[model samples]
Target: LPEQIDWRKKGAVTPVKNQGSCGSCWAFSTVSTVESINQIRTGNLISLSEQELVDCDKKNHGCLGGAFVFAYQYIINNGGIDTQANYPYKAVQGPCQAASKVVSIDGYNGVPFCNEXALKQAVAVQPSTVAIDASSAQFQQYSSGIFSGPCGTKLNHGVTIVGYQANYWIVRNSWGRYWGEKGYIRMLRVGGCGLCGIARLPYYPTKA
Candidate 1:
């Protein structure tokens, strides 16, 4: 948590979904990042459709779930997606292999897109939006430190990696703020937060 995510300025964010007791944490994280990026693109948070990634995007394992790296490649190669209203998500487990017309947009022109290492680039470029792993106490305190989780057998959640300040990294969680200052958390941004996930692209409106 470096207390300064210069790129995470404007984007959508929500809490991690309860993967229905499944090991689909990868899907949850992947979809969350994409949904926020899509919102930043359209200026209208559509919630998109995680079911598409969960059920389709077989390039990586679907129901079985895969790494964020695999999911990012799947999206980059196959274009992008639209609002959930356009294509709803089905929580039901399924295999990935859908050939729908993905909606593509232009923002970070020619910027390399990778799975694990994209966050740094996005931040280096925008510093307004990019997904990062916020599953660490240091992150919880706004300190840069790797994420750590022993509460469950596997990581089981999703959240938005927003801007960072000097003392804490700003995050918008899904869990109602009744828990942490309006569903937002200020994790320490310095010290190298390990829980921070790769920051994804920020949402931006398409030009006419």
Candidate 2:
């Protein structure tokens, strides 16, 4: 059984970012995992481009909605990605700028659906992108503690699982540091595929 693991405390997770009103949680989640893994491997915290995916990934709708799967595939095809400084997020859709390319990923992987244990284990290695139901009003006002919410299986939002405790998963949200626990959420990791169907979609990328 796993004990306590916190990527934020371990310096793997980066500072929280705000997505504003855009429905681009997918981009934030995807970029967070890439940033964490790159930091862990290279001993340097580099912010990758969420804007790259928000603007370039044509297979998915940008700002409107998207999936980390498409984002990972986009990185693989684009030869890598860019730093957040080079390709900054606009909270809105825009055109792809190839000149902003900087970092790159060799490949990626995903956990099977509804596998909470597998997801947790994967996160122990590195932060992973996972989708969750962000529709509940309780989620909006989340300031701290384990989010034992009234949320459901409607996985409409994406977030990064940075670490885990005894009975909770430490998630990094894109709602800024003002929301939740400094733009993070400790979600309940009990039965029924974890909170808000988080165990349903979990993915991580390979460094180049």
Candidate 3:
């Protein structure tokens, strides 16, 4: 167990975002991790382009669902990502526009499956992209409190593990600030795979 950790308090987290009606949570999660990682490494909070990934990353289906690993690999191979201002978000898939890229990722790594301790250690170092089972009505209607239970390992949505406190993990959501605890979820970390397989799929980018 950690003494206590909070990246928001450390000024490493970026503002919460909205993915709109698109099935682009993967893009949001990927961009958010890149943004936070860049902020931690360069002391600069630059919003990367989720739309760029949505349209470009050929290996991953944009708006139709994708994977964090695919996104990171695309970032590394495509020579990084663009700022939201340069490429902007269309809320829908489009064509690749590599001309707008502003920052690139050197590489990325994933935490071993079922290793909650390693997941915690990774977030303690930097924010990470994690997939979880967000199909529960409780999760969809969650407004407050440390959310737990009624979730499983059928990971369907992507989020960011920003910090840890006691036996809970602080997760940043892309559902806008009006949802949950200001667009964040405090999930139970007591399980072997963490809540909803959050520990099963944890990854982050290395800014270039």
Candidate 4:
């Protein structure tokens, strides 16, 4: 798995962004994945718009909640998406910007089954999309440390698995940089579903 792969250290990741109190974590996760993928292929880490997906990708539940799939599928068919500078997040859903930016992705795929070993190898290629059961009180109050959640498997938040190690996995969250280890969570690499169903739907985008 190359042992480690921190896209942040490599300059492919953006500063942590917030999802307000809105349930738009889905859009942010989708935007961040594409931002990193485009950077990997084009060498420019431009910010893509979650606002665009929040508004335009009608198939998704919008701010009510969504999975990255809703946004990714729409992105592939709509042919592209917009820049954050062009469509800045409004926290709540708005009218579709009709503002497509063409920062494209070839496609996205799921990691095979409940194996975190696969998620590790998958992350070696690129950051993988993931979610967690963030509804626990401990998680809600979480600030630092390698989180071996006293949590559940009822996935409620979306994030990205950016890197991993013998002891932990580096996760990028959209809860803003000020919260919980600068918007990143270090989840214990305790195998199986890797704490709180993280391995349940590990996904990533393909580059052209």
- Predictions in order: lDDT: 0.47, 0.84, 0.85, 0.86
RMSD of 4: 1.0
Tens digit per residue, CA lDDT, model 1, 1-208: 3424533345455443444534455555555555555555556554555566666667655556565555555566667755555555455666544445444433333223233233433443332323454455544443223223322212334444455554444555544335355555554333332234332323221222
Query: Model 4 off-target regions past 4 Å?
Result: none
Q: In what order do the candidates fall by TM-score, top score first?
A: 4, 3, 2, 1
Q: C-alpha displacement of 3 in model 4, angstroms?
A: 1.7
Off by over 4 Å in 2: none
Model 2: residue 145 alpha-carbon error in angstroms: 1.4
lDDT (0-100) at residue 72 of candidate 3? 89
Candidate 3 local lDDT, 81-167, one digit each (tens): 888888888788987775655777789988888898788788888889899998888889998888887888898999998888876
Candidate 4 residue-wise lDDT, 31-84, digit = tens: 888999898899998988898888888888888998777788988889888888
User: Best candidate, TM-score-wise?
Assistant: 4
Candidate 2, residue 83: CA error in Å? 1.0
Question: What's the true lDDT of residue 88 in model 3?
Answer: 80
Residue 23 of model 1, lDDT score: 45
Supply every candidate's count of residue pairs whose N, Cα or C atoms clash at under 3 angstroms: 59, 1, 1, 0
